[PDB]
């Protein structure tokens, strides 16, 4: 049925190029034999739908029944008479209305968006072609009160173009209806066809083009490590993270950063990723989805960082969401290093009971409330120590100005961070105070501690 509807439409398109009425030999006209067979098949399909119908009168008044009554009998009459009239044959284009239904029957159309798109396209095209055929018939056969003398020789494609121009409201005026019936038809079509065009063309254009920009998956590079970042991703969160991760005061690290978030980035985040084009990649997905976790290649990532919403309305809800994210990542890959921010300390205790949570392997839960209250307590032992500690982590360049102000000295102090590295055999066998007074200004380096492992400011006896 799907194929033969298009076949009959194409046959009508062929015939639309000929004169309006003519004599043609059925035994020597391949298109008339093909039409004869097509209409036999449509008569059989009509008979089957009639037998299957529940209410006959309801079936007789279904419009694809009406389309068969106005397109099948005249083919039979033509094949009997050995003559053809290009009469109501444009109604064949109304057969496209059932295309969506028979695609749904074939289990092809399932999604609402695709079903709606097919319905709109079918209704638009069938309406356009049918209306074009009717105006073509009416223009080529003039007005009876004018004795058919005011007919306009318009081709079917010319009428199609005129209908498109009229529907869009462009109205060139190069081609227009001139007969009274043609203009009377034009007036009624202007009411309906413009409302159809104005409604359907934007909706079709919205339905198409619904593509996901951030799809695909990360491609690992041999010899280079990559880091997956998830959780609370926003313009300021990413901007602050990239300023500290990619700072020029670290050594020449080439760790790639891969972001995983379920919200499409806004134009300012897309610009931020373009300013970091060779070091940052973003992929749209959910951290709770193992498919997305495989997409971001989290099974080969060096670590996974989970940023948290510090200013959330519900700290308990935020902690629960972060706990779920940690659970999902560990479930996909137990052996992944996870660094996360935890708002509370009881929720941190809840999280550390995870079977895959291994603090020795490098799982770090940075508890904000704990660290901030500890920093406040160290300010109670020595005021200013919270500022002293906080400035040792943030990567900062030297800034110098000509003014003699407290800010110059403060910035000069702020320019230093805490680092960690292995030290020369030339210092093995000496005391910790001795290597400290050696390192202090000769190398220009100060040591707070060494790797009975972590020892804060060792004595002279070590």
């Amino acid at each position: 049925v799907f194929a033969l509807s298009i076949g009959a439409l194409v046959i009508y398109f062929i015939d639309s190029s000929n004169p309006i009425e003519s004599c043609q030999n059925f035994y020597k006209d391949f298109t008339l034999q093909i039409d004869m067979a097509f209409n036999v098949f449509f008569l059989l399909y009509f008979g089957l739908r009639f037998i299957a119908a529940n209410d006959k009168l309801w079936f007789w008044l279904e419009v694809n029944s009406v389309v068969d009554f106005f397109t099948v009998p005249p083919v039979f009459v033509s094949v009997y008479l050995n003559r053809s009239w290009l009469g109501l044959r444009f109604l064949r284009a109304l057969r496209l209305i059932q295309f969506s239904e028979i695609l749904q029957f074939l289990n092809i159309l399932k999604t609402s968006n695709s079903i709606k798109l097919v319905n709109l396209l079918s209704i638009f095209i069938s309406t356009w072609l049918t209306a074009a055929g009717f105006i073509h018939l009416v223009e080529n056969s003039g007005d009876p009160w004018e004795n058919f003398q005011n007919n306009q020789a318009l081709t079917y494609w010319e009428c199609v173009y005129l209908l498109m121009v009229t529907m869009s409201t462009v109205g060139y005026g190069d081609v227009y209806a001139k007969t009274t019936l043609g203009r009377l038809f034009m007036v009624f079509f202007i009411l309906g066809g413009l409302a159809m065009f104005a409604s359907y063309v934007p909706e079709i254009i919205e339905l198409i083009g619904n593509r996901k920009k951030y799809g695909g998956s990360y491609s690992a590079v041999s010899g280079r490590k990559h880091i997956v970042v998830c959780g609370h991703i926003t313009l300021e969160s990413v901007s602050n993270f990239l300023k500290d991760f990619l700072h020029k005061d670290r050594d020449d690290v080439n760790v790639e950063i891969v972001f995983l978030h379920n919200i499409s980035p806004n134009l300012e985040l897309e610009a931020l990723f373009k300013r970091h084009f060779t070091q940052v990649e973003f992929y749209q997905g959910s951290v709770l989805n193992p498919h997305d976790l495989a997409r971001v290649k989290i099974e080969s990532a060096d670590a996974c960082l989970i940023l948290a919403n510090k200013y959330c309305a519900d700290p308990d809800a935020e902690d629960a969401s972060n706990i779920m994210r940690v659970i999902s990542i560990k479930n996909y890959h137990p052996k992944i290093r996870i660094i996360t921010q935890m708002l509370q300390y009881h929720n941190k205790a809840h999280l550390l009971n995870i079977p895959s949570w291994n603090w020795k392997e490098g799982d770090d839960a940075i508890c904000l409330a704990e660290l901030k209250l500890g920093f406040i307590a160290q300010s109670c032992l020595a005021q200013g120590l919270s500022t002293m500690l906080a400035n040792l982590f943030s990567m900062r360049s030297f800034i110098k100005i000509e003014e003699d102000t407290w800010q110059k000295y403060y910035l000069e102090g702020v320019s230093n961070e805490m680092y960690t590295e292995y030290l020369s055999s030339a210092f093995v066998g000496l005391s910790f105070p001795t290597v400290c007074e050696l390192c202090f200004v000769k190398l220009k380096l100060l040591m707070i501690a060494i790797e009975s492992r972590i020892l804060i400011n060792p004595g002279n006896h070590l």
Binding site: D55, P144, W145, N147
Partner: protein, 202 residues
């Protein structure tokens, strides 16, 4: 009350159709009535008359007919102009004969036009043939003619240009549409009301 089954929906659709055919038939009757009004009055206002030719002559001037040749091919060829003047039953005075209203309107300066058949020689031959057949028609037989002192004030026609059959079909088939629309409503209400009686009978 809703004892009727599914048949109710098909019957209400049948009422809709029958009503739409009633409206269509009435609307199309008015539409065709407004379109036929001026042609039908311009035809009715022209009376039948008895005529006789006063003279047949050429005015020496020539005019273009268009001759045709497939797809869109046309060119123009000259024809010589005859004028014919005729005795009249309403004004009893000179009027110019014009074979039909299309001839009157395509060249009101002239009495006849040949169907354009390529070369000028065949147009002149066909005018001379018609001219000779009209010139000897002197009182031979008062041929009937059509005239209108209000809009063809000194012009006369050999034919009605208004086909009665085409008008008859333009008013008949909208009436048939209306009658069919009434019968569909009537049979639908007759079936609907008999279904209730056949239900109550059980």
């Amino acid at each position: 009350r809703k004892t009727v089954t599914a048949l109710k929906a098909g019957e209400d659709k049948s009422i809709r159709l029958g009503l739409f055919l009633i409206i269509s038939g009435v609307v199309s009757l008015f539409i065709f009535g407004f379109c036929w009004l001026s042609p039908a009055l311009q035809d009715l206002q022209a009376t039948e008359a008895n005529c006789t030719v006063l003279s047949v002559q050429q005015i020496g001037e020539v005019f273009e007919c268009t001759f045709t040749c497939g797809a869109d091919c046309r060119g123009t060829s000259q024809y010589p102009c005859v004028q014919v003047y005729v005795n009249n039953s309403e004004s009893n005075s000179r009027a110019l004969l014009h074979s039909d209203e299309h001839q009157l309107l395509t060249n009101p300066k002239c009495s006849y036009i040949p169907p354009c058949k390529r070369e000028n020689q065949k147009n002149l031959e066909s005018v001379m043939n018609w001219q000779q057949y009209w010139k000897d028609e002197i009182g031979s037989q008062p041929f009937t003619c059509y005239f209108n002192q209000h809009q063809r004030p000194d012009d006369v026609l050999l034919h009605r240009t208004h086909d009665e059959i085409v008008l008859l079909h333009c008013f008949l088939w909208p009436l048939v549409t209306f009658v069919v629309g009434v019968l569909i409503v009537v049979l639908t209400i007759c079936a609907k009301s008999l279904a209730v009686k056949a239900e109550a009978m059980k």
